[PDB]
Amino acid sequence: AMADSELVAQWEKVQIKTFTKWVNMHLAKKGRKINDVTTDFKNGVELCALLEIIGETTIKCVTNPKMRIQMTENLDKALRFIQSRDVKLTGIGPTDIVDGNVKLTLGLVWTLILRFAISELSAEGLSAKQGLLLWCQKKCEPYPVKVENFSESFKDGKVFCALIHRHRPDLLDWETVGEDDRANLEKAFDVAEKELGIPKLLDVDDIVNMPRPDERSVMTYVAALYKVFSSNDQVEKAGKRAGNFLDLLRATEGMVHDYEQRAQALKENIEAAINKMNGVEPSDEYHQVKEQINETKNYRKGDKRAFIKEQGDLATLFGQINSKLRGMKRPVYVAPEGLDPKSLEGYIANISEAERALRSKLNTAMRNCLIALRKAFADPANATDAKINEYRTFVTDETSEAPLEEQVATLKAKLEELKQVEAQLPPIEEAEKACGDANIEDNEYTDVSFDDLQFNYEQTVSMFEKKIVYIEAQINEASSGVTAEQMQEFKQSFDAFNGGHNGILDKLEFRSCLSSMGLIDIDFTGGEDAQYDAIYNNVTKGENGVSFDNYVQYMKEKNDENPSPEQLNEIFSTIAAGKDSITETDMQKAGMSAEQIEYVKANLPQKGDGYDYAAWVK
Amino acid sequence: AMADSELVAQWEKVQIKTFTKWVNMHLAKKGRKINDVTTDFKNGVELCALLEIIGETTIKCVTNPKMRIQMTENLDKALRFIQSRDVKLTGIGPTDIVDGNVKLTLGLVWTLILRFAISELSAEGLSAKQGLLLWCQKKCEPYPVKVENFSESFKDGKVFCALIHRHRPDLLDWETVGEDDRANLEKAFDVAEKELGIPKLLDVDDIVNMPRPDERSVMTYVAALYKVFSSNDQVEKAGKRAGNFLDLLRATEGMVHDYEQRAQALKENIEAAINKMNGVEPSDEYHQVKEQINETKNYRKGDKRAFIKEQGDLATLFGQINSKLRGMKRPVYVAPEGLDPKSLEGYIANISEAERALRSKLNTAMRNCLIALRKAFADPANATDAKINEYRTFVTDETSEAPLEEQVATLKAKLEELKQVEAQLPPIEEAEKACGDANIEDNEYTDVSFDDLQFNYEQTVSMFEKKIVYIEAQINEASSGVTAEQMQEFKQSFDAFNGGHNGILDKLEFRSCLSSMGLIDIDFTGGEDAQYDAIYNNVTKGENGVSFDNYVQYMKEKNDENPSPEQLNEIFSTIAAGKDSITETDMQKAGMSAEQIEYVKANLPQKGDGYDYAAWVK
């Protein structure tokens, strides 16, 4: 019977803890927390922040008021906001909150619970407390619970469970509740804490011990029932975070499209290039293989660069996107068969093999091409040097005992044959020149030169021609008055003066010849010599040019001008008047230029009084 | 006794022939000849030419006078010249010569013989005939001859011989004359004819037959005695011809000096060149052998040309001078030993051999030089490719069963060793480049390239580094919250973004990295991003750069932003208010962008009314 009064005190102790737990449930949204409503509101600051959250209005209370006037001034403005909303003002002034009056402060925390948690639940004749009760009565209708108030009804804790299942059957089982006061209460409070976001405003020990739980406290835990809604409606903002999370996944999905676009391009472009290398056939021509070698240099400078680089970059892309997935705890991306990075690396290894196989083909094409070019020249140059030298040996061979007229037949034979090789020379000149265009600079094949060929040819032909004329001259020594060794001299000069093998001496050629022989003082280049013009007319019968026959006729006439050995004897005799030794004196009387005389003196032997010419008969 | 009168007639016959023979002896100097003095003077022309030779004066008689007046006019002027010189005029008029009077004409031919042959031989009381007789008497003093007149004295012919011997003992022997009238006479007349130039004015038959030879005739043959002098004094002009002959020989002698000067120069210049070729030592350097090869090209273009040409020209000079000698019937010129044309030809053959021996040495220098250059590159390239590939094989070999912490020790071992080969690469690059400067274009020695070396190196080192980090990551998976496959992704991106091996991410490098990951919209090149600047400050503690440790710390914080699999479950539950299948409707009420919704619809499986997320718990 005594129970009544005793009960009220312990209720106050419970009501102070639960009212505290209700304030910092809203304050925690702003990082703020309080220990005790009866002491932490004395400065007015913590009330303004609580009013600002539940009120959606900016109050500017003085952040740490030290003197009583700022605290009281604080509560005039902060309280005036409270009073603006139809909360029951009743007794309270600002000083009542500064001075820390328990029962009035609890009454003030009570009014803003009705105003800000359950106000709208007024319903055409229903207070905040009543409508909330009817709300509770509705929600547990399927359940074997008896709900009369906010004390006795809640004590079993069977009604706490019935509210959560009705809204969320997912997280709390019903076929569970029995004689475990502690279990069902803890069951509810932890469920509210972990998935509903409601703090355990109520202590599990403090309810099982008491005859009745405090109405206001349990009424307050009713604000906690809605504060679970309140939190979730703010966790719909937390649910909008998953929109950013959705964005990230959708972006990550996109970059795999960029990978696959690029990976396919690389596979395409590679297979293509391999084919171009595999498609080219190595040349035979040097300049062609040179260009073919140059085209592989063009690849390695440009596309090869690009093919290795993109492969790496795509290995990086792949790893970067899977970095994202792994970190967002979604399953890893695997690429479509043969387009994963390691298969991409393999195509690189495939083209790195195609080029090496083609450069190998092309190296060897160059070697073979180059040996060809050297053999092009060496093999015929060797064969041709051999021929021109066999003929050389032959005209050099002094010894033949056969008749002289037989010698020239045989000689003229061999020359005709050797003259035939002349033809095969200019192909050899080509092949040497072709080696110079191919910048070849050694030839293991031949030590011969084309110039050596031409010189050996031209030399050996002259040796043939020179022997055949000379043996011709020895046949005709008989019939005509010209020693074979004299004909040689004539032919030697004539041929030396006739520039081509046009078989005649020009007007101009003849002059150069005679000026050499000193038959006219060398006036050959410039002037129009009346003397020469007369000599040339004479010599060239109608050949417009000096036939060799006409040349020899001229020379014979020049020779015929000269005196005989014995005719020259008589010439001297006449000077000396028959003396064998010729004195300077009688000779002088003959009147020769001193030059003439000194020449005699220096030439022929002195024999006493004069000089002998019996030596000159020899 | 009767003899007297008979004798006079035959004398006239003899006197006409000898007077004729005397006229044409002088006329022959002008190509003119007459048959008969008694008939050939009737036109006056032949007398004028005879007077012009013996008189040294130009008469202009009418060249062929047809009418008697020109002939007579002719003889007035021509006779007047005769009369000018103190010849005895006596009876003769011009008509006497036209009419062809024998005795007067003979008398006229007689006077000009005295005037023009023996005049000056008048001597302080002596006629022309007498002084000539005393002249004869003097000259035969040593001889057993008796000289009284110009008839009987000369008949034996012993006096004719005595005159010639006295002047010229050379050509007619004295110990000879006997009873041969015919011999001594013929002996004299032929001697006078061949060497004295006097025609046989006297007939050998006509003297032996007669009692006396005609005085005037034999007197005339006395003019022939002097006409032999007269001829020789004109053959002193013929002796001046030998001055021209002397000139020719002296010129021919000169040209042998020009030959010897030139032949010596050629011998000198050749021996010298041979020595320069024999003196050069073939190079080892390519560019050097190239230049050495080029110097032989310079010879063949220039000096070789000149050396062959001068040799020929001097063969021509030699033959030309001996042409002159041979034609002037002097003995041939022989050249001083080793400077004759055929020895000159031999020195040509000697230098034609020195060049061929040197080009052979130089060909081979090139070949050996070039093989060196290829082996320079091929041998180390082959050895080095082998090493980098043995290490490649090793990191490729998947299989080792030994502890993971042992694997990384062993791995880091091999990498350190392989890293050592890095050094030997740039010498190989040189040797390849050196082959390009030596324009080598094939290499039988190696199919390797330097680029292949560098790529195989750089690739294989990355493969080592990538395995060692990954096995490092597997050791530290335990202690720190990062899967080894996640570390790989981090390291792969980081290394990909750090340009050098400076072990940090730049301000600039970090941006490029994050813009890639899309952690800020790609504003990386241009602008000064307040956001990024704030992020960079945060991340780089004081490294002025992003340490990898700092990079991983950043990435871990980005990962920590993401929700749990089961945390994400609760996020969905809250949207559906505890429904397992999520309807478009309640979700829509949550207010996601339609893009978000369509993404869900397209991603997760439809399970009745809504879409399942039990799949996403996996």
Side-chain angles (χ1 to χ4, degrees), chain B residues 61-67 69-75:
Chain B
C61 288
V62 56
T63 170
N64 38 45
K66 113 154 204 170
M67 265 287 91
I69 302 307
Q70 280 290 282
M71 285 187 300
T72 56
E73 268 272 287
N74 214 300
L75 290 180

Side-chain angles (χ1 to χ4, degrees), chain B residues 199-220:
Chain B
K200 299 194 296 151
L201 235 74
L202 275 184
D203 198 308
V204 303
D205 271 19
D206 82 345
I207 167 179
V208 309
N209 291 261
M210 305 179 80
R212 282 198 281 188
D214 182 41
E215 164 139 6
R216 287 182 175 200
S217 308
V218 173
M219 220 140 319
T220 305

Side-chain angles (χ1 to χ4, degrees), chain A residues 396-578 580-588 590-615:
Chain A
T396 307
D397 182 74
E398 46 175 275
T399 49
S400 203
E401 89 270 314
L404 222 101
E405 202 188 7
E406 279 186 3
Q407 244 156 316
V408 264
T410 232
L411 235 33
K412 204 99 52 87
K414 286 316 185 59
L415 185 269
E416 252 49 77
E417 278 190 294
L418 172 107
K419 277 197 77 83
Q420 272 179 1
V421 163
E422 186 163 70
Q424 321 161 19
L425 282 163
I428 266 149
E429 178 186 39
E430 155 277 322
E432 200 192 50
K433 282 158 154 223
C435 276
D437 308 351
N439 323 303
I440 292 155
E441 186 68 299
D442 71 278
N443 195 322
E444 55 230 70
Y445 291 119
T446 184
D447 271 304
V448 170
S449 170
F450 170 74
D451 271 62
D452 285 299
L453 227 39
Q454 177 160 42
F455 158 80
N456 184 20
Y457 179 71
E458 280 170 341
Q459 187 158 45
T460 295
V461 64
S462 81
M463 292 179 167
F464 263 83
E465 300 168 320
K466 266 181 286 163
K467 193 162 217 179
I468 68 95
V469 315
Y470 175 53
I471 291 183
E472 264 166 4
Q474 277 163 247
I475 310 300
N476 302 55
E477 209 170 5
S479 48
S480 73
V482 184
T483 181
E485 303 85 32
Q486 225 174 338
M487 262 296 169
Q488 300 211 74
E489 273 153 345
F490 293 156
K491 187 56 164 162
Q492 150 84 23
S493 69
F494 182 96
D495 287 11
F497 279 116
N498 182 37
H501 209 293
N502 57 316
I504 255 180
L505 262 272
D506 306 348
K507 26 274 176 172
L508 192 44
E509 289 174 337
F510 195 50
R511 197 170 191 159
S512 297
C513 189
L514 268 58
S515 287
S516 141
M517 296 255 200
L519 270 38
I520 191 59
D521 32 14
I522 45 108
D523 54 32
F524 63 86
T525 67
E528 202 205 77
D529 187 6
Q531 171 78 292
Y532 175 31
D533 291 3
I535 227 180
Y536 182 91
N537 261 110
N538 193 306
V539 160
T540 78
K541 283 164 192 188
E543 262 80 310
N544 331 337
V546 167
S547 177
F548 185 67
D549 300 34
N550 286 13
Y551 173 78
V552 148
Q553 193 56 21
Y554 176 69
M555 292 277 113
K556 280 198 289 172
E557 291 174 13
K558 171 268 263 203
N559 282 23
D560 288 3
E561 282 257 326
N562 295 335
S564 187
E566 81 295 349
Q567 300 175 356
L568 201 46
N569 226 55
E570 296 163 18
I571 295 156
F572 273 106
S573 297
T574 316
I575 309 295
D580 88 328
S581 66
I582 310 106
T583 72
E584 178 195 7
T585 59
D586 20 320
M587 305 64 226
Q588 271 171 140
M592 322 151 169
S593 87
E595 214 148 6
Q596 282 151 248
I597 297 163
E598 169 68 273
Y599 179 82
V600 182
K601 284 195 174 185
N603 266 254
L604 28 66
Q606 203 179 340
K607 282 200 179 162
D609 202 34
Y611 293 81
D612 191 25
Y613 60 82

Side-chain angles (χ1 to χ4, degrees), chain A residues 195 249 290 300 316 319-320 322 327-328 359-360 363 441 443 447 449 452 489 492 516 562 570 599, chain B residues 195 249 290 300 316 319-320 322 327-328 359-360 363 441 443 447 449 452 489 492 516 562 570 599:
Chain A
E195 182 50 61
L249 200 149
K290 196 78 178 297
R300 290 163 69 197
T316 302
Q320 265 172 342
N322 276 351
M328 276 170 50
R359 271 203 283 93
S360 189
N363 147 51
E441 186 68 299
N443 195 322
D447 271 304
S449 170
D452 285 299
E489 273 153 345
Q492 150 84 23
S516 141
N562 295 335
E570 296 163 18
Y599 179 82
Chain B
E195 182 50 61
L249 200 149
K290 196 78 178 297
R300 290 163 69 197
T316 302
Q320 265 172 342
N322 276 351
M328 276 170 50
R359 271 203 283 93
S360 189
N363 147 51
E441 186 68 299
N443 195 322
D447 271 304
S449 170
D452 285 299
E489 273 153 345
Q492 150 84 23
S516 141
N562 295 335
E570 296 163 18
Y599 179 82

Side-chain angles (χ1 to χ4, degrees), chain B residues 10-26 34-38 41 106 109-110 113 160 189 199-204 206-207 210 213-224:
Chain B
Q10 209 161 54
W11 285 309
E12 184 172 332
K13 189 166 195 37
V14 167
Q15 184 182 314
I16 295 162
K17 293 163 131 186
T18 57
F19 282 11
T20 300
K21 282 207 123 34
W22 179 90
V23 172
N24 58 355
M25 177 189 55
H26 296 238
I34 61 162
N35 245 52
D36 200 327
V37 286
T38 75
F41 283 117
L106 298 186
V109 177
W110 176 245
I113 284 172
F160 279 122
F189 301 148
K200 299 194 296 151
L201 235 74
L202 275 184
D203 198 308
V204 303
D206 82 345
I207 167 179
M210 305 179 80
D214 182 41
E215 164 139 6
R216 287 182 175 200
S217 308
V218 173
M219 220 140 319
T220 305
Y221 207 100
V222 200

Side-chain angles (χ1 to χ4, degrees), chain B residues 371-381 427-428 430-431 435:
Chain B
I371 73 97
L373 262 103
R374 285 187 177 74
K375 298 259 272 185
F377 170 70
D379 292 348
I428 266 149
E430 155 277 322
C435 276

Side-chain angles (χ1 to χ4, degrees), chain A residues 272-292:
Chain A
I274 298 177
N275 272 24
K276 294 253 146 196
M277 308 184 177
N278 279 75
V280 73
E281 149 226 318
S283 186
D284 249 350
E285 168 58 66
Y286 166 73
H287 298 311
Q288 255 187 9
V289 171
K290 196 78 178 297
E291 203 205 26
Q292 297 185 334

